[PDB]
């Protein structure tokens, strides 16, 4: 018997809106420590990792561990029926074919019941990155959205004086330069060695669907490993995207 009650239900809404277009079915790991999600998209190019710790929920309860096979599109449709100020309660029995959602408003109480599927944990380490950029999320979204009109891929160049995004296409090429500032309008860099990688703008524009979750986003850049685009879900956990670089 698993029961989680979140007063800020909007979070859940935003989370699913950030995921439904990139992964359709995913397995939710329910445990005493919280809810974790880890899934690759159908094309096996990017990795999604969601963490919602039990301490972010106003009420949390988990008797047995769960692996809920959820169709993210359907759960998104159901969550579209919840107001942004609604208190959302997830609840599922042990031998349940369904996951129950309760939307409490202002005397209105909706109750939905969603069918689950039988769904069949990639090795994510824990690393330290050569270049880590903290920047406003809307700025990153605007940059990816603009450079998409110029080329297919964005070259992220990361040096001690700022981060530069560059694109090239048949109509020309463009370069955007962000310099560090002197709190969430800030651009800060933690650098051990300069980095420069190439990524597909298609997937970054998928990642920026998580923008309403946080005012800031962090880009952790490899050497020749995947990029990590991280949005902090304040007080609850985080949503992380891993994108493999382009070696053509």
């Amino acid at each position: 018997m698993f029961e989680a009650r979140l007063v800020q239900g909007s979070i859940l809404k935003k989370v699913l809106e950030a995921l439904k277009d990139l992964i359709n079915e995913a397995c939710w790991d329910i445990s005493s420590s919280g809810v974790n999600l880890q899934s690759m998209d159908s094309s096996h190019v990017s990795l999604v990792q969601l963490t919602l710790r039990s301490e972010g929920f106003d009420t949390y309860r988990c008797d047995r561990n769960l692996a809920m096979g959820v169709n993210l599109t359907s759960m998104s449709k159901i969550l579209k029926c919840a107001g942004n100020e609604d208190i959302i309660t997830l609840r599922a029995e042990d031998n349940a074919d369904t996951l129950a959602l309760v939307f409490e408003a202002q005397e209105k109480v909706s109750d939905y019941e969603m069918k689950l599927m039988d769904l069949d944990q990639l090795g994510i380490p824990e690393q330290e990155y050569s270049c880590v950029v903290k920047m406003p999320s809307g700025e990153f979204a605007r940059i990816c959205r603009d450079l998409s009109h110029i080329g297919d891929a964005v070259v992220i160049s990361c040096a001690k004086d700022g981060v530069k995004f560059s694109a090239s296409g048949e109509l020309g090429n463009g370069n955007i330069k962000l310099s560090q500032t002197s709190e969430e309008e800030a651009v800060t860099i933690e650098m051990n060695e300069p980095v420069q990688l190439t990524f597909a703008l298609r997937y970054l524009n998928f990642f920026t669907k998580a923008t309403p979750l946080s005012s800031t986003v962090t880009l952790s850049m490899s050497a020749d490993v995947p990029l990590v685009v991280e949005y902090k879900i304040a007080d609850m956990g985080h949503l992380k995207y891993y994108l493999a670089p382009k070696i053509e």
């Binding site: 690759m40 096996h44 190019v45 990017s46 990795l47 990639l122 090795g123 994510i124 380490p125 597909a200 490993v225 995947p226 891993y242 493999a244 670089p245 382009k246 070696i247 053509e248």
Partner: peptide, 8 residues
């Protein structure tokens, strides 16, 4: 494009 399956 390199896959994610080639890293982990």
């Amino acid at each position: 494009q390199a896959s994610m399956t080639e890293f982990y």
